[PDB]
Amino acid sequence: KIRSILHRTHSDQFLVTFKEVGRRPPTFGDASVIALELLNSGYEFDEGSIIFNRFRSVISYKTEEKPIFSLDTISSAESMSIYDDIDADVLRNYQEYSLANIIYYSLKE
Amino acid sequence: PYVLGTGLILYLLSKEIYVITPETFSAISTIGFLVYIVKKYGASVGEFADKLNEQKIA
Amino acid sequence: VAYWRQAGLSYIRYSQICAKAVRDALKTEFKANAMKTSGSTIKIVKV
Amino acid sequence: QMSFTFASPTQVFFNSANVRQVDVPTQTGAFGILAAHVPTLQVLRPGLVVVHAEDGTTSKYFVSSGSVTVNADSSVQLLAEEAVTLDMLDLGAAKANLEKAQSELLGAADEATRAEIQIRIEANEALVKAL
Amino acid sequence: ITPVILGLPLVTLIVLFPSLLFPTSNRLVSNRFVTLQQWMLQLVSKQMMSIHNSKGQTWTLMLMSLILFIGSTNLLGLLPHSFTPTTQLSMNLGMAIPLWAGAVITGFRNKTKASLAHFLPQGTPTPLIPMLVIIETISLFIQPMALAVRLTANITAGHLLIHLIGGATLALMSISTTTALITFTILILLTILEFAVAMIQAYVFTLLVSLYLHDNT
Amino acid sequence: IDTAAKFIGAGAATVGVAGSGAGIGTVFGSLIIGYARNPSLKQQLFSYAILGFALSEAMGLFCLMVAFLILF
Amino acid sequence: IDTAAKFIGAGAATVGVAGSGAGIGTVFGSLIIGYARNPSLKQQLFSYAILGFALSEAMGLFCLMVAFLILF
Amino acid sequence: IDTAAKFIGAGAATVGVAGSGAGIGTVFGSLIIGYARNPSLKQQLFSYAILGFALSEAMGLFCLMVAFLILF
Amino acid sequence: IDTAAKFIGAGAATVGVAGSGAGIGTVFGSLIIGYARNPSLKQQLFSYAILGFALSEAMGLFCLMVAFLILF
Amino acid sequence: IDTAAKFIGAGAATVGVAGSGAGIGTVFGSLIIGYARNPSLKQQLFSYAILGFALSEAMGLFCLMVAFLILF
Amino acid sequence: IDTAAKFIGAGAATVGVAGSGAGIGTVFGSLIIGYARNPSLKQQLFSYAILGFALSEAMGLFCLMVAFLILF
Amino acid sequence: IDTAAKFIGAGAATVGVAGSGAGIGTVFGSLIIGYARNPSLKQQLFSYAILGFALSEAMGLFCLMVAFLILF
Amino acid sequence: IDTAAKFIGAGAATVGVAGSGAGIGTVFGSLIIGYARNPSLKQQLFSYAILGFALSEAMGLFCLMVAFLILF
């Protein structure tokens, strides 16, 4: 239903699309899937959003949009230092993981 | 001002109450003492703001 | 980047296999839920 | 005190619970995050988590991977990919898996595969820790 | 007679004015005078109280008197020369009993056999090994108490060498100044690096020791 | 010879305090980097720094006993 | 024998300062690397580097007093 | 010659306790930063510290066995 | 003897500069490891490296003073 | 001269045990700061610690055989 | 005695080159473990490697100046 | 003179073997913490440790050859 | 005295090889704990280790030529 809407210069500007996640639920398994392959692609951070329907209450959800950032580099800058223990590994391997977490999450929302 | 004058007198007394001091041993320690002044005055201008205000606050 | 970031390997890639390997581990009882909890109904297209 | 958030996508065990320490199978191996342990960000290894909770408890776990997060803030976040209390692992399986796993390693032949088998093997090791 | 007799009264009197002047500031005046001098024990009650209590208010002011007394006594060895090699040494030996006795007042006086029972029961000394307790009774007392005398005596030494190397440089190059001024300018700055630092760390020893008393008290 | 070798021999035994001097800076150094990793300062960590300065000044007290044996 | 051995006694007693200078480099290095991990610099940790640079120089004043004893 | 060189030669063997005293500050310091990463305090880490200091002061007790064999 | 032992004593005091030399490397090495952890190079950490080279050359100037006193 | 210099010649070779004294503290200390990172304690690390302690007491097996040669 | 002690005094100040040679091993070591942290290899770290090996070889060139002065 | 100071010249040459003994521990102890980061045991680090044990015991061989020179 | 103290002056000059031997252990140890972080084995870290063991035994060749001047 993302593909569906997107065709608005967004048939060329899809990178990938993931599919039929409802009708027999999505999972972390899935999430990891979408996560993994996503990375690889010279598309990584190009800012943007992860736009998903964030569930809010029975009666509500509010569709979210995110900042999507995965450049270990500006996650060099700032606070990164502060909560120390970091590497463009562990960074990434959280960045990754949180991408997964979110991807899953968001999806599930 | 009065405090400074008292401290100088004390230093003199002590110099005089000794066996033998060299021109040298004094001058060194005198420039040691001398050096402190220039920093001390710039610090001293700040110093006052703390303590008088700290009384007034407490 | 050693063997779970290999030269490459996603941390995911790894990770998922780890977790998967955990899922593989454990008892079966639980594993019913496992794949169930790690579907991948994610069918894929590029568009 | 340290607020320990222990979760897996599957479960939240602790959520910022005033645990005094959690000793973590991070990819560090560990660093046994003390309430007075510098905030730090870690990627999780497969090993065991021990939740020294300010309550005379150390609770046992294995986590596979994920990331653990030690915020500046009192909160520690185990975001465990697979998160188990050691309670639910299967020892039997581990051994059996482990032979098999190694075997497959013997037949592993992509860097990645090798990695993977080894991973697996290792996994069984990191499980084997407990098991 | 007079030379020693003028020095010890003077040392007391320089501490006595500050020790009288602050008690005085508790109502008058203040003008310039009292409020200016109140800063002195505000600097004590600001600076040293940042570390004190700590051990409790009870002990705090008891130590702070010695902390100022030690620094003031070394300052009355600062200006004087010559003074350091003889009089400050006789004052380091005259402070040696006060430094030994300073642990005596509460530590050795209440427990001579194990003043580490007040200072450190398990730590420096092995509590499993009363032999190491008595051994470390010197390295926590008998030697630290001699090291504390030495600790004021190397400030004395480092101060002295500034004056002595000192003097040995313009005595060497009595040129007025001239090239001795270069080395002499260094030897000066050594005043700060030696005496003013070590003088600090000597009262830092009194700080820590009277912290370890009164932190275990 | 009898008053000579005991006056130059008491000086060589004072080179045993070079071990306790740098050995005290390390045990108090790793406690500065240890409390930097935080936070069990009082008790456990800084209570062990006394147990590490006592086993290091024990060889110092053993060396200062030797130099005082040839001096008195 | 009497006038000579006291000069070769305060010379070997100055080789005990070889620990007070290197141990101070060990403690002030561990406070230089310790403050990097942050953030207790103007308290807690640099207030423990003064307590370390003193205990290291404590075998540097005890050794220096022996070299000042053999001379004068 | 037979008694003189026995008093200045027992002082040079007291400089062999410089390794047992600086080594003890390394066997306890690397145990301070060791338990800082934690958590095995009693057993494993501090148990390995005792088997390390025993192998550090052994070169101090054998060096005080070659010291006391030159004076007694 | 008296004009002899002054040369075999002023040289032994130069062995006290072994702590000043190895203390300068350790205080600067951990400053090179502390500035490798980033970022306060300009003051705070390398400023304290000057406060660590001074409290380490002080046990090297006091040892060079005793060597100069036995030579001149 | 012949028997007199054999006494202050095995005493200077006894201060060579200061390298093995602190070298055993640096080796076993690193193993205490290694098993803290965990978990290859049994074999791999502690087994390599017996290879490092033997290669550090090797200099101790060559320095104590030197002083025992100038004795008898 | 007058000609003997200068030779024995030149070697004693040559033992003060043991502190400069290990202080260069600590400064270049903590730069080798300070470049592994990455990435400013040129400038910052290895540019301060010669700035840390200058103050540590400054204790050697002053010590080998006191060793040459007793030879010429 | 000829037979005397050759015996006290080999002993101080054996004190130059105190760098190799503490060098052996600091080179095979950093590899005891290298494999703690894992997994280059019998690959790169343990192979370079032998190339680090050889560079340090050679400065013990070039010092034991001076001790054998003043003995035969 | 002349043909004696130069044989005991080359022994004290060979004690300067305790810094070229313990400086190599500090250098070829941090390039073993730094390569454990990986993967700059060739061209970078071990290349700087050639320039690390060049300013380490440079204080030792200067200490091996000081003993060679007190022999030949």
Residues D83, D61 contacting (CB under 8 angstroms) = yes
Amino acid letter, E75: L
Residues near A67 by Cβ (< 8 Å), separated by ≥ 6? A47, A48, A49
Residues of chain L in contact with residue J34, where contact means CB-CB under 8 angstroms, are 32-33, 35-36
Residues near D8 by Cβ (< 8 Å), separated by ≥ 6? D63, D66, D79, D80, D81, D82, D83, D84
Distance CA C11, CA M14 (A): 55
Q: Which of D9, D18, D76 is nearest to D49 (CA)?
A: D76
H22 interface with G at CB cutoff 8 Å:
yes
Question: Searching chain C, which residue's CA lies closest to the CA of residue A39?
Answer: C10
Distance CA J17, CA L11 (A): 12
Neighbours of E13 (CB within 10 A): 11
Distance CA J32, CA L32 (A): 10
Residues J59, L21 contacting (CB under 8 angstroms) = yes
Helices (H), D68-110: 91-106
H or E segment to which residue D5 belongs: strand D2-7
Say how far residue E63 (Cα) sits from the centre of its chain.
11
Domains of chain C, each with CATH number or no CATH: 1-47 (1.10.1620.20)
Phi-psi region of K43 (alpha: psi -120 to 50; beta: other; left: phi over 0): left
Q: Are D85 and D107 contained in the same domain?
A: no
| Domain extent at residue K21 | 1-72
Positive or negative, the CA dihedral L3, L8, L9, L14 is positive
Q: Which two tokens stand for residue M68?
A: 């060679």
Query: How many interface pairs between F and H have CB atoms less than 8 angstroms apart?
Result: 136
K48 interface with M at CB cutoff 8 Å:
no
* Coil, strand or helix at C1: coil
For chains D and A, having 3+ Cβ pairs within 8 Å is answered yes
Residues of chain E in contact with residue G16, where contact means CB-CB under 8 angstroms, are none
The residue assigned the tokens 């045993």 is F16
Say how far residue J72 (Cα) sits from the centre of its chain.
23
Rounding to the nearest 10 degrees, give the CA dihedral for residues K4, K5, K7, K9. Answer: 170
Distance CA C41, CA A107 (A): 12
Distance CA H3, CA J7 (A): 10
Question: The domain spanning residue H18 has which CATH number?
Answer: 1.20.20.10
Beginning with the edge strand found earlier in the chain, give each strand of the sheet holding D66-70 in spatial order.
D12-19, D2-7, D75-80, D66-70, D40-44
Q: Which of I66, H71, M17, J46 is nearest to L15 (CA)?
A: M17
Residues L40, J38 contacting (CB under 8 angstroms) = no
Beginning with the edge strand found earlier in the chain, give each strand of the sheet holding D83-85 in spatial order.
D32-34, D21-23, D47-53, D57-63, D83-85
Do I58 and E193 lie within an 8 Å CB cutoff? yes
Distance CA D97, CA F29 (A): 47
Q: Are D70 and D115 contained in the same domain?
A: no
Task: Look at chain H and report how many structural domains it folds into.
Answer: 1
D129 interface with J at CB cutoff 8 Å:
yes
What residues of chain E have any CB closer than 8 angstroms to a CB in chain G? 143-144, 146-147, 150-151, 153-154, 157, 198, 201, 204-205, 208
| Phi–psi pair at A63, nearest 5 degrees | -65, 120
| Domain extent at residue D111 | 90-126
- C-alpha angle C34/C37/C38, rounded to 5°? 85
Half-sphere exposure of L32 (CA within 13 A, CB side): 30
* Long-range pairs of K42-51 with CB within 8 A, sequence gap ≥ 24: K44/I35, K44/I41, K45/I32, K45/I35, K45/I36, K46/M48, K48/I28, K48/I32, K48/I35, K49/I32, K51/I28
Structure determined by: cryo-EM
Q: Which residue in H14, H65, H72 has the most chain F C-beta atoms within 10 A of its own C-beta, making it the best mutation to test that interface?
A: H14
Positive or negative, the CA dihedral E186, E192, E198, E201 is negative
K11 interface with G at CB cutoff 8 Å:
no
H or E segment to which residue C27 belongs: none
Please, is J46 exposed, middle or buried when counting C-beta atoms within 10 Å of its C-beta (0-12, 13-18, 19+)? middle
Q: Which of H62, H65, H71 is nearest to H20 (CA)?
A: H62
Q: Which of K48, K44, K62, K52 is nearest to K25 (CA)?
A: K52
Distance CA E174, CA A108 (A): 89
Task: Look at chain D and report how many structural domains it folds into.
Answer: 2
Q: What DSSP string describes E80-91?
A: -SS-IIIIIHHH
K32 interface with L at CB cutoff 8 Å:
no
